[PDB]
Design a protein around this nucleic acid. Structure first.
Lengths: 98, 25, 110
RNA sequence: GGGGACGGGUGAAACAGGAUGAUCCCGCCGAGACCGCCGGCCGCGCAGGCGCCUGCCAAGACCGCCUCUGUCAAUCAAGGGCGAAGGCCGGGGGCUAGAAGGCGAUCAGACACCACCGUAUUCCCGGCCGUAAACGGUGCCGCCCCGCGGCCGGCGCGCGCGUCCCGCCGGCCGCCCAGGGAAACCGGGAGGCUCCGGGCUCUGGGGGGAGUAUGGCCGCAAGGCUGAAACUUGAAGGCAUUGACGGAGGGGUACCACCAGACGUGGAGUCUGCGGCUCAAUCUGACUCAACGCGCGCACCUCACCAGGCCCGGACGCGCGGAGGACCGACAGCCGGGCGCGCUUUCGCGAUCGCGCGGGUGGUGGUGCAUGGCCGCUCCCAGCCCGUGGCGCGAGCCGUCUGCUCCAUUGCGACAACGAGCGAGACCCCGGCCGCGGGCGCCGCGGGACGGCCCGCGGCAGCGGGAGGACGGCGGGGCGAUAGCAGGUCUGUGAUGCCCUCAGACGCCCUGGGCCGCACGCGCGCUACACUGGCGGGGCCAGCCGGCGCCCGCCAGGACGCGCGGAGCCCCCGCCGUGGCCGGGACCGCGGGCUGGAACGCCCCCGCGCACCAGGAAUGUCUUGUAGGCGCCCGCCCCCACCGCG
């Protein structure tokens, strides 16, 4: 039967969306059916962050942040645990965890 | 995709049957 | 370390409310003697009695400091009732304008 | 140009790339594709579809409206146009990726997945094709219908005045009251429907055969469209519930699992089972865990098997016969290991009854898949479930928890559940410690310990330590839920259905022999491979629990008596001394004992002196008095343990 009302993709008022490539698996997934998680990590590791600042000659230097959007396919996401198989009731919960 | 592979096998056999009729008539 | 069984736990809660005056909070030996009276509590088995008496001691230290659910303290009950039946003096509670004017009461108007 | 040696690629590699300077860094140039992040429960479009900048050209829905027209409309065979991608036909163009093809791996194979190279293709223009899970798997136009939110576009109302607020209209959505439905779900319908009728078009009628065949039409082709029958079959299918499984996720948990270690097996010589072989017979049971020193010690008996033999122990009841003969016993020879067993024979004895029939009594004979009982296994599990109430048409759920805690549905905090019960715990046996009483003998009754205290951390349940204390957080055992296995036992059983047998016995005995043979394969074990050892004297230490003396014999053992009683290891001093040696003790020739009716059983003395110099691929058990080493007792038992249980 039909597991999900959205059909697993957010396609409303549309017959065709753009094609995105899963970064790990290099597959072609529609834009609506993609993980789309945006991550802002600092350029350096937080273990090496303070010692970089001490070493940095420039005063008032701010460590660069890395801004990237990681998009994955369902197979290339459930296996990396970015999304998890949920209970039928838990599946309905659309709120992001934490 | 057995059902698609079934129609690929069928098309290949109908093509052959056409060739035999082309050899005759 | 060893989780107490429901029979040991339930019995201990009944013993503590019944003998709240008799039991003392931090002494297992004093509480073992109360529990083994064959009057205020009949516990067969030396090991069962020792196990129930030890829960009772833990629960008694909880009763004196921040009491816990399942135990009925007459001493706490009277204080709770006193506040429950306490009257706050003249009651400050005794002492949207368009709505008041709509009723026509116009209380405190101007 | 610079600089110097490895780059690529993977899951790990490898094939190509490199002193003709790769990779890397920077400048610069050419080529074609493509338009990131923003980018969406945004929007637009008839669908297919649509995202660079700057113009140009024509649109479309929506909203507002006291503008015009006056039914001009709805849905639609045929007919027209459009239609992703791939394909095809001409021109181009060619950066990437990449059907084919080629390689390098993988594997049992791999011409697959993965790496690498790369043609068509991908892109544009002019056409063909006419299909997609072209999906909302939901035709179109119309009416009413229940709240609650989000977004988008236009417009109106208040209000200071804000990309507010409240509407309205159109769109896109989420939840959902009824209602519907086989349910999942739909609820802007899949509502207003067995209480059935707004209009219009299309399609289906069990599952195959088969979208096949043939005919038509269409296309350059690929193919599209229209579309059978013969014949076959009893289901195919939908949705949901429960189990089982997952190379699914999240929790846990166990030396029958691993870490970390130990101590082994496998190698060998033996002991001893199992299969195979051979037999007169080698009686059989059973075969992953959960078969294989298991069915409690096979000379006979056991013993169920083989080759001979002996009777009745066939009760009872009837027809018949019958006490001077129903029956039954035998000497001597003879045959026969043998037994009046029979025979020759010629003396005994007394219904102990004969026969026929009907009916027994048996059977270690079969069928454990006909059964009981008992045990093994799932399960060294923690789970199983009831009453009443709730939810569904129901199967079946809730309780019985996806939170935490615990050895553990062990608890706590909750909670359409609310109270219970079983298993867990408690209990029981033992041990260690302390009192009291008793005492031929250490053996009777109690206590002690509970996560109680202390410190941290935790609503809590608990958690980590510190202590004190014989003893510390399940000390070791016994008992063992629920539901099953078509596990095993009919050869333990006056347990037993049914079949077989049933005086030429499958009854029950009696002699002899096998089960113990053995080209071989395998499972427990045992002893070794030595010096931390062997060999000689000396010390001498137990416990479940337990007799001795004296004399002779090399021991083994014996005789004659009586009332009693005790280890190895290790320690100590010698010796041999790295040699298959004095390691090791398999074999094999005399001999001495024992037990029994009888050796083929066991013990012992002098020889004799096998492998094995540390065991491959594999595999098992184990966390303190544990592993391992080292003795000892008991079970079965004439004797006998390399076994089991202690």
């Amino acid at each position: 039967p039909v597991k999900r009302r959205n059909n697993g993709r957010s396609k409303y008022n549309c017959g065709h969306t753009n094609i995105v490539r899963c970064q790990n698996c290099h597959r072609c997934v529609p834009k609506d059916k993609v993980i789309k998680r945006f991550t802002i990590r600092n350029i350096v590791d937080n273990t090496i962050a303070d010692d970089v600042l001490n070493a940095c000659v420039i005063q008032g230097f701010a460590i660069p942040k890395l801004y990237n959007k990681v998009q994955y396919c369902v197979s290339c996401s459930i296996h990396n645990h970015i999304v998890r198989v949920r209970s039928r009731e838990d599946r309905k919960i659309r709120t992001p965890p934490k | 995709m057995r059902a698609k592979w079934a129609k690929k096998r069928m098309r290949k056999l109908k093509r052959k049957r056409r060739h035999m009729k082309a050899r005759s008539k | 370390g060893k989780v107490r069984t429901k029979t040991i736990k339930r019995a201990a809660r009944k013993i503590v409310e019944n003998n709240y005056e008799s039991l003392k909070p931090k002494d297992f030996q004093n509480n073992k003697a109360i529990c083994s009276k064959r009057n205020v509590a009949i516990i067969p088995s030396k090991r069962l009695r020792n196990k129930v008496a030890g829960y009772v001691t833990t629960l008694m230290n909880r009763v004196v400091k921040g009491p816990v659910h399942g135990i009925s303290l007459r001493l706490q009950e009277e204080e709770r009732e006193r506040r429950d039946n306490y009257a706050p003096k003249k009651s400050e509670f005794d002492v949207t304008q368009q709505m008041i004017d709509s009723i026509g009461f116009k209380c405190m108007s101007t």
